[PDB]
Design an enzyme around this catalytic site. Structure first.
Site, mmCIF file in Angstrom:
data_model
loop_
_atom_site.group_PDB
_atom_site.id
_atom_site.type_symbol
_atom_site.label_atom_id
_atom_site.label_comp_id
_atom_site.label_asym_id
_atom_site.label_seq_id
_atom_site.Cartn_x
_atom_site.Cartn_y
_atom_site.Cartn_z
ATOM 1 N N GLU A 152 0.126 -13.286 18.770
ATOM 2 C CA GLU A 152 -0.426 -13.649 17.690
ATOM 3 C C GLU A 152 -1.400 -15.524 17.941
ATOM 4 O O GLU A 152 -1.576 -16.254 16.714
ATOM 5 C CB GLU A 152 0.899 -15.135 17.718
ATOM 6 C CG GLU A 152 2.177 -13.708 17.572
ATOM 7 C CD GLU A 152 1.993 -13.370 15.472
ATOM 8 O OE1 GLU A 152 1.170 -13.755 14.807
ATOM 9 O OE2 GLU A 152 1.422 -11.875 15.448
ATOM 10 N N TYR A 209 2.784 -6.555 22.283
ATOM 11 C CA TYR A 209 3.312 -7.249 21.276
ATOM 12 C C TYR A 209 4.206 -7.585 21.591
ATOM 13 O O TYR A 209 5.441 -7.895 20.875
ATOM 14 C CB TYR A 209 3.147 -6.468 19.293
ATOM 15 C CG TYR A 209 3.475 -7.637 18.278
ATOM 16 C CD1 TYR A 209 2.217 -9.044 18.969
ATOM 17 C CD2 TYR A 209 4.354 -8.076 17.100
ATOM 18 C CE1 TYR A 209 1.962 -9.647 17.635
ATOM 19 C CE2 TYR A 209 4.009 -8.716 16.148
ATOM 20 C CZ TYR A 209 3.397 -9.240 16.402
ATOM 21 O OH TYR A 209 3.618 -10.637 15.404
ATOM 22 N N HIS A 268 -6.347 -9.358 14.279
ATOM 23 C CA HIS A 268 -5.303 -8.506 15.533
ATOM 24 C C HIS A 268 -6.058 -7.644 15.687
ATOM 25 O O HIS A 268 -6.049 -6.993 16.481
ATOM 26 C CB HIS A 268 -3.963 -8.231 14.607
ATOM 27 C CG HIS A 268 -2.546 -9.472 14.722
ATOM 28 N ND1 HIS A 268 -2.591 -9.676 15.634
ATOM 29 C CD2 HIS A 268 -2.050 -10.033 13.805
ATOM 30 C CE1 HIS A 268 -1.121 -10.820 15.610
ATOM 31 N NE2 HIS A 268 -1.655 -10.824 14.059
ATOM 32 N N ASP A 318 -11.400 -0.646 -11.770
ATOM 33 C CA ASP A 318 -11.560 -1.915 -12.738
ATOM 34 C C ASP A 318 -12.944 -1.164 -13.862
ATOM 35 O O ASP A 318 -13.373 -0.829 -13.190
ATOM 36 C CB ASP A 318 -11.471 -2.916 -12.123
ATOM 37 C CG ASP A 318 -11.605 -4.001 -13.282
ATOM 38 O OD1 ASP A 318 -10.577 -4.170 -13.639
ATOM 39 O OD2 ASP A 318 -12.594 -4.426 -14.018
ATOM 40 N N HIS A 369 6.783 -15.489 17.301
ATOM 41 C CA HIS A 369 5.637 -16.394 16.147
ATOM 42 C C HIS A 369 6.344 -17.220 16.806
ATOM 43 O O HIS A 369 5.976 -18.688 16.205
ATOM 44 C CB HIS A 369 6.524 -16.030 15.613
ATOM 45 C CG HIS A 369 5.805 -14.376 14.650
ATOM 46 N ND1 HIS A 369 6.047 -13.053 14.602
ATOM 47 C CD2 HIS A 369 4.884 -13.916 14.312
ATOM 48 C CE1 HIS A 369 4.951 -12.429 14.284
ATOM 49 N NE2 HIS A 369 4.184 -13.277 14.282
ATOM 50 N N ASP A 387 12.621 -11.801 17.559
ATOM 51 C CA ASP A 387 11.148 -11.491 17.321
ATOM 52 C C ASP A 387 10.098 -11.128 18.249
ATOM 53 O O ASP A 387 8.914 -12.056 19.261
ATOM 54 C CB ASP A 387 11.012 -13.097 17.144
ATOM 55 C CG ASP A 387 9.539 -13.476 16.484
ATOM 56 O OD1 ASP A 387 8.621 -13.302 15.781
ATOM 57 O OD2 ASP A 387 8.521 -14.588 16.480
ATOM 58 N N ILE A 438 7.014 -27.111 -2.872
ATOM 59 C CA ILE A 438 6.867 -28.374 -1.798
ATOM 60 C C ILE A 438 5.644 -28.264 -1.586
ATOM 61 O O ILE A 438 4.987 -27.756 -0.727
ATOM 62 C CB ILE A 438 7.424 -27.310 -0.875
ATOM 63 C CG1 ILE A 438 8.959 -27.152 -1.038
ATOM 64 C CG2 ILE A 438 8.083 -29.013 0.010
ATOM 65 C CD1 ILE A 438 9.949 -26.713 -0.389
ATOM 66 N N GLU A 470 -3.307 -26.250 10.390
ATOM 67 C CA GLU A 470 -1.909 -25.542 9.875
ATOM 68 C C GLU A 470 -1.551 -24.208 9.204
ATOM 69 O O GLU A 470 -2.789 -23.993 8.882
ATOM 70 C CB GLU A 470 -1.199 -26.291 8.479
ATOM 71 C CG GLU A 470 -1.766 -28.054 8.824
ATOM 72 C CD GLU A 470 0.160 -27.978 9.690
ATOM 73 O OE1 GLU A 470 1.391 -28.270 8.774
ATOM 74 O OE2 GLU A 470 -0.211 -28.490 10.205
ATOM 75 N N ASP A 497 -6.415 -18.610 5.532
ATOM 76 C CA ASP A 497 -6.378 -18.599 7.446
ATOM 77 C C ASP A 497 -4.986 -17.537 8.226
ATOM 78 O O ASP A 497 -5.276 -16.422 8.734
ATOM 79 C CB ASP A 497 -5.859 -19.878 7.729
ATOM 80 C CG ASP A 497 -4.358 -20.597 6.904
ATOM 81 O OD1 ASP A 497 -3.846 -18.855 5.979
ATOM 82 O OD2 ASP A 497 -3.778 -21.259 7.286
ATOM 83 N N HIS A 509 -6.049 -14.450 10.383
ATOM 84 C CA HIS A 509 -5.121 -13.989 11.434
ATOM 85 C C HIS A 509 -5.331 -12.249 11.565
ATOM 86 O O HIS A 509 -4.911 -11.615 12.472
ATOM 87 C CB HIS A 509 -3.262 -14.998 10.347
ATOM 88 C CG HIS A 509 -2.907 -14.435 11.621
ATOM 89 N ND1 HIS A 509 -2.467 -15.476 11.829
ATOM 90 C CD2 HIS A 509 -2.139 -13.103 12.069
ATOM 91 C CE1 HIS A 509 -0.805 -14.883 13.131
ATOM 92 N NE2 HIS A 509 -1.250 -13.456 12.485
ATOM 93 N N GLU A 510 -4.695 -12.291 10.163
ATOM 94 C CA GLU A 510 -4.606 -10.397 10.312
ATOM 95 C C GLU A 510 -5.629 -9.682 10.202
ATOM 96 O O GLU A 510 -5.051 -8.422 11.714
ATOM 97 C CB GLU A 510 -3.982 -10.004 9.123
ATOM 98 C CG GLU A 510 -1.822 -10.589 8.692
ATOM 99 C CD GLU A 510 -1.772 -10.623 10.329
ATOM 100 O OE1 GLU A 510 -1.386 -9.573 10.596
ATOM 101 O OE2 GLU A 510 0.012 -11.077 9.947
ATOM 102 N N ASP A 529 -14.656 -3.065 -15.839
ATOM 103 C CA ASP A 529 -15.667 -3.680 -16.859
ATOM 104 C C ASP A 529 -16.385 -4.895 -16.047
ATOM 105 O O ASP A 529 -16.950 -5.701 -15.914
ATOM 106 C CB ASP A 529 -14.963 -4.241 -18.062
ATOM 107 C CG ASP A 529 -14.194 -5.780 -17.968
ATOM 108 O OD1 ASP A 529 -13.800 -5.418 -16.900
ATOM 109 O OD2 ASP A 529 -13.342 -5.940 -18.878
HETATM 110 CA CA LIG Z 1 4.444 -25.531 0.283
HETATM 111 CA CA LIG Z 2 -4.620 -23.580 7.052
HETATM 112 CA CA LIG Z 3 -11.508 -5.662 -15.595
HETATM 113 ZN ZN LIG Z 4 -0.018 -11.935 14.051
#
Ligand SMILES: [Ca+2]
Ligand SMILES: [Ca+2]
Ligand SMILES: [Ca+2]
Ligand SMILES: [Zn+2]
Ligand SMILES: [Ca+2]
EC number: 3.4.24.27
Length: 316
Positions: A166, A157, A146, A57, A231, A226, A197, A187, A138, A142-143, A59
């Site tokens: 998971e 997996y 792993h 980048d 999951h 899956d 939503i 959540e 989250d 989460h990732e 600046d």
């Molecule tokens: Ca939503």
């Molecule tokens: Ca959360």
């Molecule tokens: Ca910039």
């Molecule tokens: Zn995962």
């Protein structure tokens, strides 16, 4: 890149302003040299070739809408690194300060994020199901968990081990969200999931059945989708982990909660010392009982709550 460590400022996916650690060498790069061997963020430029170009980048100010996802990936990887270091004394995901790499703007309209074995990858979402996935702390934790699992238990997996893999990622992602105190909840993915939503999320740990996931071992999914339901059946473990922490009565079984901190110490211990690549749910229960036993004694309340929690989701 070799250069001078400095601090830039930008805006994340949700519009919040934050400082990020950058490196200067002609351009300002998203390279944080203050944590381990570094946190590096890349631009995949809507393609699927990885990692892409280290983000550069002119600046050191990252307020363009194209910058948002890079800001949050870079910042939330540093917060996750701090969580593992301060809370569990673990230096990066391998325990030896491995560099953490992430690419954003992967592909076009991609509704996912993932740890591919060497780095983190985040799609931008199609704008309807998801907004850029690195806006969810989250999801980022989460990732990144792993990667932790990959270097420790090595849970494969698929089937029950994949479901545990998971659930571990949803538990620590949620614990990281509470650590940063970013409007925490039980959540998963609610900050980036369906911008039109309010109130929903990808998965719930406090009531997995809200979205149709099982919350009891007798409702487990036994098909082949899956990867055997990694999951879907993770909801059984997530529910057990929520009960250990928060307490509650589930299918008639009463559990006294012992809180989030103890939950994270017991599961981190089970994960790094007793779980193996093919562990199943019943072995998870025994690893968790043994971990609480090691930490608090076999006649502690902590051991008693881990047992009631697994009894409440039907895991023996
Ligand atoms: Ca939503
Ligand atoms: Ca959360
Ligand atoms: Ca910039
Ligand atoms: Zn995962
Ligand atoms: Ca939240």
């Amino acid at each position: 890149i070799t250069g001078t460590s400095t601090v830039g400022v930008g805006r994340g996916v949700l519009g919040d302003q934050k400082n990020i650690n950058t490196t200067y060498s002609t351009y300002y790069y998203l390279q944080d040299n203050t944590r381990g061997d570094g946190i590096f963020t890349y631009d995949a430029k809507y393609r699927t070739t990885l990692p892409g170009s280290l983000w550069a980048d002119a600046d050191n100010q990252f307020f363009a809408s194209y910058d948002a996802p890079a800001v949050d990936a870079h910042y939330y990887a540093g917060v996750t690194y701090d969580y593992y270091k301060n809370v569990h004394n673990r230096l990066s995901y391998d325990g030896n300060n491995a560099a953490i790499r992430s690419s954003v703007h992967y592909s076009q309209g991609y509704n996912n994020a993932f740890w591919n074995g060497s780095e983190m990858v985040y799609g931008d979402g199609d704008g309807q199901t998801f907004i850029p996935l690195s806006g969810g702390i989250d999801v980022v934790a989460h990732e990144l968990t792993h990667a932790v699992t990959d270097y420790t238990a090595g849970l494969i997996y698929q089937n029950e081990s994949g479901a545990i893999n998971e659930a571990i990622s949803d538990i620590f992602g949620t614990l990281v969200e509470f650590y940063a105190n970013k409007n925490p909840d039980w959540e998963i993915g609610e900050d980036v999931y369906t911008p039109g939503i309010s109130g929903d999320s990808l998965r719930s740990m406090s009531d997995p059945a809200k979205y149709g996931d099982p919350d009891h071992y007798s409702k487990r999914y036994t098909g082949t989708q899956d990867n055997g339901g990694v999951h879907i059946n993770s909801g059984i473990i997530n529910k057990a982990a929520y009960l250990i922490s928060q307490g509650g009565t589930h299918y008639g079984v009463s559990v006294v909660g012992i809180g989030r901190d103890k939950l994270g110490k017991i599961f981190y211990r089970a994960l790094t010392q007793y779980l193996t690549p093919t562990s199943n749910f019943s072995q998870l229960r025994a690893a968790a009982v043994q971990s609480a036993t090691d930490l608090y004694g076999s006649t502690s309340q902590e051991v008693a709550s881990v047992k009631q929690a697994f009894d409440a989701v039907g895991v023996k």
